[PDB]
């Protein structure tokens, strides 16, 4: 009495990872055009995204492309002559490099930094150093074109496939979203690297939402996603004179020449008050999820500076803050704030960060980057969005000791890409009908199954149907001929909803029409008929092969 | 702190006889618990990585499951090769260890 | 084959600092963490702490912070553990381990030797 | 240019030379044995 019906367009997708691209990449379209899916919920799970990993390789790859065209400094490589910058932090270094004529040699006089030199010899008159690393790997020096501003990157979907946003005000990362939208491009996304602090980040709608994948482990970084920002404010006041050589045929070297005025170390700004009302409804929120704890905030116990310190670029110059005045509190089950009397404060916490120059790029080990010294002062503002906080293990007297962390850069991607989730459309499908044979893009995702039945014609054309979108594009038409040639062995070519002769099994569903077409939604029937979609694609060709034999026999008779 | 309380403190067998040992977790919620074997004079070898999931290069004869804050090893049978001290793990936290 | 190669026994004196290096081998040496267990003669397993050799990353457990520094060497793929104000009750076994997959870094199926370290007057 | 002696210590020679080193400003000496 019931008969399967091929329909074609249907509002089904499920879990896949594509490789989406990047649209500044490609002029990005006026609005992202979202649909908001009405009864929908789906599951996420920001720590097993694929956008976050696809975004990883995106920025590690654009930085390394900006370096390629630019002056290696294979001739600095040399033993330098160094003495104290007293006309230690900063050291005075002779040397005698190579010129841009081939038969020559120069002399040359170079400031430089103590944390990028290490000592040939026993260090004290001039010592010999070289620069960190230069005798392990290649030091390139960044072109004076390269934009250290982070630009946001929207990224947008291959043609047949859907970004699931999440709209949840206070969802943490994992489990169950309602309320979820459908979206072609995501939000301007900084690539923004800084260590311990996420910062020009996307703010909390509601309030603080600790996240993390396992919060009973010490492993998973906790990101704490804040919903007002701190403003952190960072200088270099030290006036710079910039001197710069050539070391070959158009190859040429800046380096600090002299220091106007007097030397004043590099350093950063944050109120007492607004930093530890923070810290309070940090503190608050943290006892939500470790009850009758005490919740203490350290200072981080051991590593290298790039994850000892907070670590960020101002206008190109990479800085390194102790923040151990910042991460000092106690807060007890009792309410009270030990380090208290800061919510009436006119004080700021000065944080002494320190200036390096011979960037170890990422973790690449075998490439290095020379920040060149920019002419003057530097002063940068930023907005403090959020913390990443890691947890000390073992055996404790009910206290948490949360120590800043950081270091993987794919927990700063992680916290502005979780309520990103990719998936596939799968447009073709079946259902029992009584037929037999003789808006937006899944808009009708949460509708029921006999309203979602005519918006075909939407979700149909919105198939559209270097090497990294090449590919997702000769895919997705694999993908679409695919289809096509099933619809056409089972003689349904050139339809969206075809009738056939394939009997309804009661053992596939046993539902009445009234229970599928008027009840569920075509998500709920595809969790239902999958494991028996390999016996009806089976008979349905097996029922064309029998129809096509059939119908050359009729049109052989006369 | 999630202190892991592992039973019998020492187990009296024979070759052949079914062991049971037991680990009870103060807290759970996920089902990452794993069983070491170590041998006197030995590092510790892992034989059930996850509560459930077995670990190669280990005989079908060792086993276990659970969820939660209880979870179960046994042993198909003890064979002479198999003297040795059992200990759970759930993350940083050791149980207390079974001797077999 | 993945090896992981610890110092030989040592003794000390209470109050002295002893220093103990895994030698890694076999493996990427910056993808995977390294976790330091000290096994007490006769009173288990205390897990004591992980290093993670990217970074350089720790978390000592919080009965053994202040005393128990750890430091990686990359250019020999070679761990290093400190601990410092030795007692005499800190007498063990002390184990190198990695987990099977850098995902999941509980799974210890990697072990090195054992380094005896004898504390007594 | 490589200052080679019999392996007397043919089929192999104890080869020295100067090369450069990792500081691109000092040289090396070094002895090799090539066939
Ligand atoms: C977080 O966002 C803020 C604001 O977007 C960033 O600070 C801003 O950085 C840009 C680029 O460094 C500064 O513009 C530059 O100004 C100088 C002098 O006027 C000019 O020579 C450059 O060509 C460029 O226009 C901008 O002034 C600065 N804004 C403020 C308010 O200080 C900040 O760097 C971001 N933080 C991170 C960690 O990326
Ligand atoms: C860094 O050292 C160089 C010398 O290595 C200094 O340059 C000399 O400065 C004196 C100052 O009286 C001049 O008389 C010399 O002629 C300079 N020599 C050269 C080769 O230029 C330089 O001033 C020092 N700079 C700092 C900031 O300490
Ligand atoms: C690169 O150069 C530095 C500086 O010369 C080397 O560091 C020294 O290495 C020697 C090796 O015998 C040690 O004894 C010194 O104590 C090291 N000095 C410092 C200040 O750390 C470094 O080893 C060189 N790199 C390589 C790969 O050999
Ligand atoms: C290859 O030649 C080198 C010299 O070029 C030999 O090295 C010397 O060996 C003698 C042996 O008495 C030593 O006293 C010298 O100190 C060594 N010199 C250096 C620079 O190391 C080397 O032994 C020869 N090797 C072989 C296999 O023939
Ligand atoms: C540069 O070369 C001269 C050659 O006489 C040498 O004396 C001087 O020390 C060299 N400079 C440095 C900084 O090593
Ligand atoms: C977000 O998810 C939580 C999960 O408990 C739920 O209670 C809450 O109602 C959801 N919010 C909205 C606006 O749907
Ligand atoms: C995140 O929210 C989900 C909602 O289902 C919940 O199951 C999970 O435990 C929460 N995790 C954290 C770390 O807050
Ligand atoms: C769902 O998200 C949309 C996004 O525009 C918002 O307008 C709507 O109020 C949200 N609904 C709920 C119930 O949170
Ligand atoms: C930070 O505060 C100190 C207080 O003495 C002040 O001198 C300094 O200029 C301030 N720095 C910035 C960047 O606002
Ligand atoms: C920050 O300053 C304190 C001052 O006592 C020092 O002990 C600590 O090591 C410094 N931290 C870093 C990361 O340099
Ligand atoms: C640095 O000093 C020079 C010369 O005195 C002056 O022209 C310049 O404005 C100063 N720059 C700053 C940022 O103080
Ligand atoms: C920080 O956020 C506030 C929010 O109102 C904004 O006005 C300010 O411009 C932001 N600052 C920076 C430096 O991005
Ligand atoms: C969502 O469910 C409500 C239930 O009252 C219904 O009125 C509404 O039409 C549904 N929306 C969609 C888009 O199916
Ligand atoms: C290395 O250089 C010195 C410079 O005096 C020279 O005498 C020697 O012959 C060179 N070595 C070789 C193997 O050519």
């Known amino acids: 009495n019931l008969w399967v019906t091929v329909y074609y367009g249907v509002p089904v997708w499920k879990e896949a990872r594509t490789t989406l691209f990047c649209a500044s990449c490609v002029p990005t379209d006026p609005n992202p055009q979202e649909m908001v899916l009405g009864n929908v919920t789906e599951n996420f799970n920001m720590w097993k995204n694929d956008m976050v990993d696809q975004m990883h390789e995106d920025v590690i790859s654009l930085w390394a492309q900006s370096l390629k065209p630019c002056v290696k400094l294979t001739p600095l490589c040399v033993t330098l002559e160094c003495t104290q910058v007293n006309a230690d932090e900063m050291k005075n270094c002779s040397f005698n490099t190579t010129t841009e004529i081939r038969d020559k040699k120069q002399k040359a006089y170079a400031l430089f930094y103590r944390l990028d030199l290490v000592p040939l010899e026993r260090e004290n008159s001039a010592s010999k150093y070289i620069l960190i690393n230069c005798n392990t790997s290649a030091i390139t020096q960044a072109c004076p074109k390269v934009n250290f501003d982070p630009i946001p990157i929207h990224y947008c979907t291959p043609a047949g496939y859907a970004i699931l946003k999440c709209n949840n005000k206070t969802f943490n990362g994992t489990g169950s979203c309602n309320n979820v939208s459908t979206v072609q491009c995501t939000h301007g996304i900084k690539p923004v690297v800084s260590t311990q602090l996420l910062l020009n980040g996307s703010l909390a709608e509601e309030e603080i939402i600790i996240r993390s994948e396992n919060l009973m482990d010490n492993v998973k970084t906790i990101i704490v996603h804040l919903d007002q920002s701190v403003e952190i404010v960072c200088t270099r006041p030290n006036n710079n004179t910039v001197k710069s050589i050539r070391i070959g045929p158009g190859q040429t070297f800046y380096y600090t020449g002299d220091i106007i005025g007097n030397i004043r170390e590099a350093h950063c700004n944050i109120s007492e008050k607004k930093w530890h009302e923070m810290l309070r409804r940090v503190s608050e929120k943290l006892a939500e999820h470790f009850p009758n704890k005490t919740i203490k905030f350290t200072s981080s116990s051991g590593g290298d500076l790039e994850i000892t310190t907070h670590s960020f670029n101002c206008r190109g110059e990479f800085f390194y803050c102790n923040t151990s005045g910042l991460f000092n509190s106690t807060y007890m089950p009792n309410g009270t704030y030990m380090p208290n009397g800061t919510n009436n404060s006119n004080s700021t916490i000065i944080l002494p960060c320190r200036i390096k120059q011979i960037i170890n790029m990422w973790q690449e080990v075998g490439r290095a980057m020379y920040a060149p010294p920019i002419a003057g002062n530097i002063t940068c503002n930023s907005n403090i969005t959020g913390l990443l906080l890691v947890r000390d293990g073992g055996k404790n007297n009910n206290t948490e000791i949360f120590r800043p962390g950081g270091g993987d850069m794919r927990d700063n991607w992680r916290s502005e890409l979780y309520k990103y989730k990719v998936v596939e459309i799968k447009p073709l499908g079946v259902a029992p009908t009584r037929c037999k044979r003789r808006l937006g893009f899944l808009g009708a995702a949460g509708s029921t199954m006999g309203a979602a039945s005519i918006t075909l014609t939407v979700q149909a054309r919105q198939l559209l149907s270097g090497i990294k979108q090449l590919q997702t594009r000769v895919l997705a038409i694999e993908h679409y001929l695919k289809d096509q040639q099933l619809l056409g062995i089972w003689g349904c070519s050139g339809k969206l909803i075809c009738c056939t002769a394939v009997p309804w099994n009661s053992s596939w569903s046993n539902k009445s029409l009234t229970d599928i077409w008027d009840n569920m939604t075509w998500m709920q029937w595809d969790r239902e008929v999958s494991n028996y979609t390999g016996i009806i694609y089976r008979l349905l060709e097996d029922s064309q092969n029998q129809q096509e034999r059939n119908e050359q026999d009729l049109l052989a008779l006369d | 702190d999630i202190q892991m309380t592992q039973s019998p403190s020492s187990l009296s067998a024979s070759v052949g006889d079914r062991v049971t040992i037991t680990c009870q977790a103060s807290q759970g919620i996920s089902n990452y618990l794993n069983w070491y074997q170590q041998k006197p004079g030995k590092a510790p070898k892992l034989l059930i990585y996850?509560?459930?999931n077995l670990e190669t290069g280990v005989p079908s004869r060792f086993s276990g499951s659970g969820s939660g804050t209880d979870f179960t090893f046994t042993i198909s049978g003890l064979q002479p090769e198999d003297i040795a001290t059992y200990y759970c793990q759930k993350y940083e936290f050791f149980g207390g260890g079974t001797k077999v | 084959q993945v090896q992981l190669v610890q110092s030989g026994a040592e003794v000390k004196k209470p109050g002295a600092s002893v220093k103990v290096s895994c030698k890694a081998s076999?493996?990427?040496?910056?993808?995977?963490?390294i976790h330091w267990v000290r096994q007490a003669p006769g009173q288990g397993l205390e897990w004591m702490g992980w290093i993670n050799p990217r970074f350089g990353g720790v978390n000592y457990a919080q009965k053994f912070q202040g005393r128990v520094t750890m430091t990686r060497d990359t250019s020999i793929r070679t761990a290093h553990m400190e601990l410092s104000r030795l007692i005499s009750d800190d007498t063990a076994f002390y184990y190198c381990?990695?987990?099977?997959?850098?995902?999941?870094?509980?799974?210890?199926?990697?072990w090195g030797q054992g380094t005896l370290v004898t504390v007594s007057s | 240019t490589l200052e080679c002696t019999q392996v007397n210590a043919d089929e192999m020679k104890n080869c020295s030379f100067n090369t450069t080193t990792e500081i691109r400003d000092k040289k090396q000496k070094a002895y090799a044995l090539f066939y």
């Open positions: 076999g493996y990427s040496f910056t993808d995977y963490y």
């Open positions: 996850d509560a459930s």
């Open positions: 381990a990695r987990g099977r997959f850098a995902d999941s870094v509980w799974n210890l199926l990697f």
